[PDB]
Symmetry: D2
Subunit: 495 residues, 4 copies
């Protein structure tokens, strides 16, 4: 009787269970949903698949979904972010089937995702079937689904494996990213097992809730091109998520990540924060809090002025690359820090990325620079030395998100706010499942939760911090044209 979950160690379960209980002290949003909905079980019968950093905080999310009645299969959306003790808790209590561990190979990542997406047909002659709902962080669960369908249609056309899957090259001629090569390797394997797999999932698939900015961007592109195959909810852009998680969460988790990976003192150092959006604002605020001299880079004139108003210098990377001490990428873009920028940096300069993917820093070009010399400084920290100048740079966790790679990500309070939106999004998608009609080619769309619910998430966490909310009088409520119980701001308010 072997277990189907693949994790590091099951005996670490008890530590994970005690950390979940401690975290729950601050996660009053998820604690309230469990208290309120565990009897009625609003998600009963739902098969949920999650692709999201399996941390302690996430384990409480999965438990919340379980207590509400869903069967769950889960994996991580990054090779370095899983907390093995959190994973073990879920498996020990039989809360969810898990395919996740810390320090996975890229190939392991894609097999764990595919397995998480695979469901056995219960009492209907066991064969392949998919999930009903998806919890996604970065869009990888959503991508494999879409790329699977695309690969299957292309397969029937010529009745053979599509040429783009087998090849290692791309449209241009350069080497494909390891992430793509492994994803294609898995799709090719599934075409040989069963070429109707991905399209078979669509009939019982009712929606996906996306957690982060980069995943939402991917979802919006598909929506405008009319290629979105399931309804979706943008959890990232809820006020109680983007204004707290992205900003305040990072203020603390970036520092935790830098302290663990970088041995140096952040005070007095020139630290460049590339991108001054919701994540960058938080990164800059924490770095200043500990004495760093932050220097910002931006493409957006509005964001540039905001950094300027907070006392920060705004330069282009090329003018400070030789004097700066530390570089933190928070743009969600690609090739922000190139091999050529890295060759100009000072001795032992530190490079980190807090964006979702490792495309911001050119890690592939760094690792494959002719005659590069690399050494492990500690777990998930590497020093690269160029052969011509003999100068080095220290990269934190191969360009993957530093707060989750070298630390544990955001703390429970802000995660409960993000995850309360997730549960509320999952319920909305599940309760609406009847409107999803697969007959007429009705395009699928991306929507946000109501402001009513967004304020509700905030109300659920006021007691954690001993916040005493003032209440409006009928006259006051009428004077500012709002209901005593809200909402209190118009739909375009920016907080």
């Amino acid at each position: 009787y072997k277990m189907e979950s693949r994790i590091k160690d099951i005996s670490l379960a008890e530590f994970g269970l005690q950390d979940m209980e401690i975290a729950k002290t601050d996660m009053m949003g998820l604690v309230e949903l469990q208290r309120k909905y565990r009897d009625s079980k609003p998600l009963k019968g739902a098969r949920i698949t999650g692709s999201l950093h399996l941390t302690i905080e996430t384990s409480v999310l999965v438990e919340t979904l379980y207590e509400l009645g869903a069967e769950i299969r889960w994996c991580s959306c990054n090779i370095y972010s899983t907390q093995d003790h959190a994973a073990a808790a879920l498996v020990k209590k039989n809360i969810a089937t898990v395919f996740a561990w810390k320090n996975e190979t890229i190939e392991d990542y894609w097999v764990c995702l595919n397995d998480a997406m695979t469901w056995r047909n219960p009492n209907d002659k066991d064969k392949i079937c998919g999930p009903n709902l998806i919890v996604d962080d970065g869009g990888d669960a959503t991508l494999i689904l879409h790329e699977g369908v695309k690969a299957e249609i292309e397969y029937e056309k010529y009745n053979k494996i599509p040429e783009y899957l087998e090849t290692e090259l791309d449209e241009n001629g350069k080497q494909l990213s390891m992430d793509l090569k492994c994803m294609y390797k898995v799709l090719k394997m599934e075409l040989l097992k069963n070429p109707f797999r991905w399209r078979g999932m669509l009939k019982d698939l009712y929606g996906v809730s996306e957690e982060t900015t980069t995943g939402v961007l991917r979802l919006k592109i598909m929506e405008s091109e009319g290629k979105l195959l399931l309804p979706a909810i943008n959890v990232n852009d809820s006020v109680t998520k983007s204004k707290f998680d992205n900003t305040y969460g990072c203020r603390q988790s970036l520092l935790h990540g830098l302290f663990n990976g970088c041995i140096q003192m952040l005070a007095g150092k020139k630290i460049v924060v590339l991108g001054y959006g919701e994540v960058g604002k938080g990164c800059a605020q924490g770095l200043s809090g500990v004495g760093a001299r932050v220097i910002v880079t931006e493409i957006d004139p509005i964001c540039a002025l905001q950094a300027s108003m907070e006392g920060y210098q705004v330069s282009v990377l090329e003018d400070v690359v030789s004097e700066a001490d530390i570089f933190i990428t928070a743009t969600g873009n690609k090739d922000v820090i190139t091999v050529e920028h890295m060759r100009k940096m000072k001795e032992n300069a530190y490079i980190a990325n807090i964006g979702h993917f490792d495309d911001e820093i050119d890690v592939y070009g760094l690792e494959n620079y002719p005659g590069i010399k690399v050494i492990e400084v500690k777990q998930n920290v590497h020093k690269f030395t160029f052969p011509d100048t003999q100068k080095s740079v220290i990269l934190l966790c191969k360009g993957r998100l530093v707060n989750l790679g070298c630390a544990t990500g955001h703390p429970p309070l802000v995660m409960s706010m993000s995850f309360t939106n997730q549960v509320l999004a999952q319920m909305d998608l599940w309760k609406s499942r009847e409107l999803v009609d697969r007959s007429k080619n009705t395009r699928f769309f991306v929507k946000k939760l109501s402001k009513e619910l967004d304020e509700y998430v905030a109300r659920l966490h006021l007691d954690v911090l001993g916040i005493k909310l003032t209440k409006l009088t009928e006259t006051q409520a009428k004077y500012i044209n709002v209901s005593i119980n809200g909402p209190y701001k118009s739909e375009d308010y920016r907080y």
Copy 2:
């Protein structure tokens, strides 16, 4: 009070003219618009009436509108905000016809507004006509126009002066505010002169651009009930206005206000910021900057958490009113500090308002409290002593916006940003005047400026602060799905 300005002292012109030139160093947005459009003159022929705090920064606005071809008549939107040397400058160099001075009585304020609205067309027998466009701040120019129209329709329904314009009481038997009585006093006088005055203005009236949150509130109410009789542009909600003027403007001008009117040290004091919106955030940020212990009051749970995340205590006024030292209202609401709260305050507590109207603090109840003792500490600073406790509270400029009442308001940089949106809004309203056809549509809506123009306002002020903007490469532009030249964010982005 016809075509000859009415100011305090013309001899102050040279000081006003030199401060304008110094201010222009940072008001690059307005400087660029003058350089760009003074030849073509897009506003040529427009009669503009402005109701906005007549400061040095506003003079540059009026100059800009004048250089673009407009004829202008201006007044202030507050009895204490006018800067007499700024008003003289406009009159001396003959840029506009001004009706404003510092420390006006409420009676004269409404006369000044009514005078700025009155024009004499020299082509059609020198008859009384109205303005083509209105620059409003607080919605008073818009209010007198709409109330005037309702007064004329009510005047013809019975062929007599309506009862509400003569009585000093409202529907509940309470005394009407001096501002309503003084406005009704003007409307009555205009019904006797010409009962078709306000309805006559509407024919040539093509728009209004509103500056502040409180004015937009009034516009939204009218709009939703189909009572807005002219097109409107909401300048307040432009990113380059709301997130800079409201927040960073107050961060500096609140302190200037308190330093001039309040003699005590702010460091270590418990200062209560009521409302943690865009103005409140800036207030708290400035106060903390000089060592104060800020305590926040809120009705909005999201804003309450935002305050909490910045390390601020969030309480209801009743729990801290006895121990707190200073009180700052920034809600844009009414009855936030009642007489009963003022009686519980400690000896020499200071009270100030930074919202647009004096309604936040019950100033009328305090001044008319039986046996109240009142003395002038300095110009626009009064100490009120209650007879039963012998305790005193010190009120800054009778509850009117303290930054403009006790000091000179926000500095030129953010006002240039706020005023670059104003000029662009006037040009929009004027260029699209042909689309206003009253034989078809008499009810209008409020719109905001595009994000293209919003980002443009920001480009114009980058060089002021030595800001270096990064430029996206084609690959980066394509990867994040935006144009190299912008816009760089989606319409729902909150910056």
Copy 3:
């Protein structure tokens, strides 16, 4: 009243009202008045004061008055006097005042001289001096020493000394107007009575110095063996230097910048020259409103401290063309020269917060050939160079900006500084029998840590502070008394 020279006596009512409001936070002075107004430990003492006559200073004068002293006062700067504060004192016959806002440099020295002059009680109509001096900057102390030096040189040759009658100095450089007018007053007094200043030594028992610059002048006199009276360094009390110098300026520099400079401080590059106690406060306040502070320093320890607070530390010559605003806080000379001013960007603002105007080369700027000056507003001037046609805006002619363009530090910190002043005066007065002028060099000393802690205790209730009390076991473990002192003499706080 009769003697006094002030602007307007009608402003007295507003001054008295401000004093009462200020007293809410100045619990130190209020307490000293409550406790010592009956016994009057300073009764019969004649006290002369040279210190920025502000509302806060009027409460100090009122306190010294309630404790029994007879007072004559003047300001230590030509722009810092608050006319309503000086009126309040005259109207209540608390002191004979010689001070007004916007004095000429010449009148400044005539006021100080008048403050130092006292008619001999009811004995006759002969002139004598003060028993005690309250000084800020060292000018009251300087005129006494230069007056004695001038009288000795007078009797040695039986004529006026040549150095008092010349307008050029050592290397043919024009003398500062402050020396010009001081020597002018000294020459006038040698003609009326060549024993005036030396006669004041007989009854002069001490001086209490308020600021860092004045203290430097005292220690130089002490080390050269030329100090003619005992002195107390009030500036170096923990309750003065750690609060007045730092947190005082954090608020009052901003007040002054907001009144003189119309521009927004957010995002601007503001150079703070000197990162001492005043510099630290300046930087903290500037950052609080979004400025990007750049620091200059000579001390590598203070430079590293600046670096730890996230500030860029540079030499002025590398940032003078790009910086927007300049704040000198070194207490040194020629920190900003005319050459530096010519490299500055159009409409760059320059200001000083140190005690004297010497930090900026104002005289060189005003006298630059072809220079064109215009008055922007009260005590704010725009200077324009003839060759480049570029301009710089100087605040209140290089004199201390917080008191020049605004009203100085708030009451709370001044109370801490002035409670130390009153305590210094009481000390000097109680030891007047030990001053024997017929044997002895005088020394500069400081108040004890006990009195330093006492000053702090007197201001805790203002801010609602709840102090913890050590148990006997804890007091023994950390080796202190329950009632203090809690730190060693070398503790830096």
Copy 4:
């Protein structure tokens, strides 16, 4: 004896690589090696060190070694050792080490005693002592003095003193575990040789103390006339106290809390007890990440300073129930008692950043009748009272949290503190001839000059790209100083 006692020698390679990376910011120690490795001013000196064996400490040890010293070392806390750092020293034969993370209190004093034990081979293998001591907290100095004191008492009545063979103190109260284990070692040494400690005095030339608590101990001995060797107070150097104690903690406290405490610090009411040099840095760090800092103080001067930074100042009793996290930074005892802990809210965190664990009543907590304890993770324990069922979470049994749950201060500030240490060691060695034992003379505690203090700041300016301005002839004369310093009077507080 002769060989080291450490966790794992294979960790040495990681230790050496972290040392090399740390040297980028420790230009004080790098400059001292460059300058003095050839002349070797410490040549022949035997040095025993009791100081947290971290990577930063390993560079200190390496510096003393490059200057010609023979070294024996141990940690000054049971949880502060970094095993890779300890192993790096043993691999290069830089020193003989007795230290590892998670020592039992017994093993602590045994290691310290071993580090003090020198095998002089020029006398056919016979025991002697060190020439110089580098100390942090005063334990090396404590075992020396108490050792001497025990031998004098032993020799008086010719038997083992009864105060060493007992669980009780002067008033029948149980002795701290550290005293019993120290005494257990002192008794052992009386049995082997009752002249051991007094024999060390002959060649012992001095001690350089790192921290505030150890300095307090030294000053008490000085005033009572019981100090047995010259001492140099390194804590009170300006380049130590104003940087290490304040800015070091600003970062290392947050690192410790982040590793030990899973919760978000933003919006929480965090109580910082003591607003001294350490308290100031802690509060500054906590505010930086959005916490609401509440301060407790006994000193009204320090209380007003807190108030000037916008912090509420309260007595612990009025906030113990509502506060979320408690950080002791007083250097005192019984600042947080069992009775305070019983009133705290569910899952309140408690930590100490003072040198010793006495600030929190840990012994009382662990021995409370019916208390239930569980290990949450490495060095983090949750205690649950049986009557209320409420729990408190203690970080690393009340020991300095920055070094116990994290890796202490970063290299830059430690280089400043340790550059002072080396200079203090060189001073004590240079002046060894002035120590005349054959007289019974009083020994004093002295501080390094302001000249060498400014010198330490100069050696680190380049690390952060600081361009220092230089005084002109006229300016120097105006402020009455030399162009090359010192620039401040001795009483200046920075």
